[PDB]
Structures are given as structure tokens and as C-alpha cells.
Amino acid sequence: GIDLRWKHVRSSHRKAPKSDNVYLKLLVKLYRFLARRTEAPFNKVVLRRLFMSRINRPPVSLSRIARNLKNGNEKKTVVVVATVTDDNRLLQVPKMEVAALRFTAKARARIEAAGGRTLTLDQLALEKPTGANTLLLRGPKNAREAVKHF
Amino acid sequence: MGRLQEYQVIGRHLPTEANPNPALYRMRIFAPNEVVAKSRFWYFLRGLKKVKKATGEIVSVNVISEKHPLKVKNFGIWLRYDSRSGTHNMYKEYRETSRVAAVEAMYADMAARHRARFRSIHILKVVELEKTEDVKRPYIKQLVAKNLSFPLPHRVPKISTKKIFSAKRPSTFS
């Protein structure tokens, strides 16, 4: 016998999505290839967040994007691996280039009306395969009723 | 107790600023090997001079071989042994060819006759008896007798233990 005071630890992170979305499966295959064949940490972060569940992908609004676009970030490509929502409190949308998992209809319309560009994550992989000149944004994770009641 | 050797073990206390040249202590230890010899040396030194192994060091360990292992000698051994009553003196004699052989015969003798184990026996002196008149015990005195000669009655012959059956009844006369 071998005395094992310590225990070998099985993985406590997602290795694959629980979702059955076929397009998400194709995106996961593409970003698995990118994370394997590139040095860019952006690709690994994007792959890991593609694995994530919905409460771990809180929505990001246009006002949050506009806040993070200030101070030299106006020309960077905004990357969100959640839903980009519209904020009607923001009356003037700045010109921006946003790549997201999905957009609401009003957010897409307001970005295109302000003159920015809307992309999917496979288009982001085509144009910035190393994540160059990107601004990676996450939504407020703790802004949930369950988290308030914890 | 075992295939014993005699070792000269010389040790000392570790030198300090107050005592740059400490005294050397020498002992003659009967032991199966050098590790046991040094352990017995430090045990006796702790019992006598209050010098510990941690504050001391071994200067020399040498084997003391017998000068004449082909010469028959008589040995006197003064020992002290511990029983449930306490510590008892004993003088015994052994007819051997070496001091080590006499000491092993002594250990076997003590174990057989008084159930004294190795750790309860302190060997104080082993001497070679210089003259025949120095022999005190009758069991050595009968052996040092002039013109000693005896027969060997009732000698069981050496028969192989793998030969179970014999065709003739053996004799006990040679």
C-alpha cells in the first residue's frame, strides 16, 4: 500500500459546453483549433467563456460598452461572449465595432445606425485570429437576484 | 552473543574554547561489529564519565586480534550480572584459544545457567592465567591434569538424516 495523505484532484472547470446548439459546437471546434495552434491567451479565454453557462455570461449593455470605449479605446474591437443589450438611457451611441455571441435587435439597429459594425465570433476569428487590438468585456456577474439573496 | 570481535575504541569530548585538548578515553569492547562497539562505548561512557554522544566524538576503532590463536589458554573472567535481586559478582574460568572465544563461551554459559541476557552482563576483566597454579575451578583443574587421556564411550555414529532405513543395527563403540 501507498500512504496518500493528499488526494489527486479531478478537474473543477468545464471542458465542453453543456449546450446542444450545433452552431455553438462549430464555434467551439474553431476556437479549440485556435487555442491549440496559437500563443494568444485571448483565444483560450474566449474558448473557456464559450464553455460557460448563462449565469456565467451576464449581458453587456451599450452604455457599459461606451464607458469602456473611453480613454484611448475608441478604435479597439469590443469582444463580448454574452448578449449585447440596448440601453435607452444612453441617448447617443458612439461609433463602435462589436463582436458578440448575439445581439438584441435594438442593440444591433442602434450600432448600425451610429455607424459601427456588428460581428459574430467566427467573423472575429477571421479578422483578428490573435485577438489583436481587442477590448474584452464581461457583464456584471453579481447583479442577480439569487446572488443578492445569497 | 554472536561472532564477536574485540575492539579498541578511543573517544573524547568535543573540544571547546575552555578545553581545547580534551582527554582521550579507551575501552576494550566485545561486539559483533563496529556500530555495536561504538554504541556500547558511548553507553559505558554515559554511565561513567557523563560524556554524551552528541557532545563527543570517536577518535579510533581498531580490531584487537589474538596474538596466539593456536595456543591453548586458560582464561579467568570477572563479570557482574543483573538479576531481579540486583547486581552480583562472578568469577568464572574458560579453556579456549582466544579472548573472544572465551567471551562467547561466557555469554552462552551465563544464558544457559542463570538466564542472563547480553544487556544485563558487564564484563569487568578478562585475563589469561599465566600459571597452572592460577587455575581455581575444578572443571579446568581436571583438564590441566598431568598425562590427561580419556576414552569416548557410547559414541552415536553419524548417520545421514536422509537415509531413513538401515539394514544393520548400528554400534556405539567408535
Partner: protein
Amino acid sequence: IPPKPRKILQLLRLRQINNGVFVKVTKATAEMIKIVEPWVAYGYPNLKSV
């Protein structure tokens, strides 16, 4: 096995019977080996053994 000898054997990487390791002799290692003496046999290896 009591917890202190168990911890010393774990730190010496002697997790299985007939496991062996090389140790540099210091006081800090010699006292550990002296504590785990009821479970170990140790000594000074020569070049052939090494």
C-alpha cells in the same frame, strides 16, 4: 503510525514500504531521520550502491 512520524515520512517521500531516498546529512535532516527510526533503515552508501 502517529501523525508526526507520518508527516516526516511524507516529507522524506517514503510513502511506501521498500521506498528509498538519498539525503544530504545535516542536523535538520538527521533529527528527522532519528525520529522516524522505528520505520526506516538507513546508512552510508558507497559508489557501487549509488
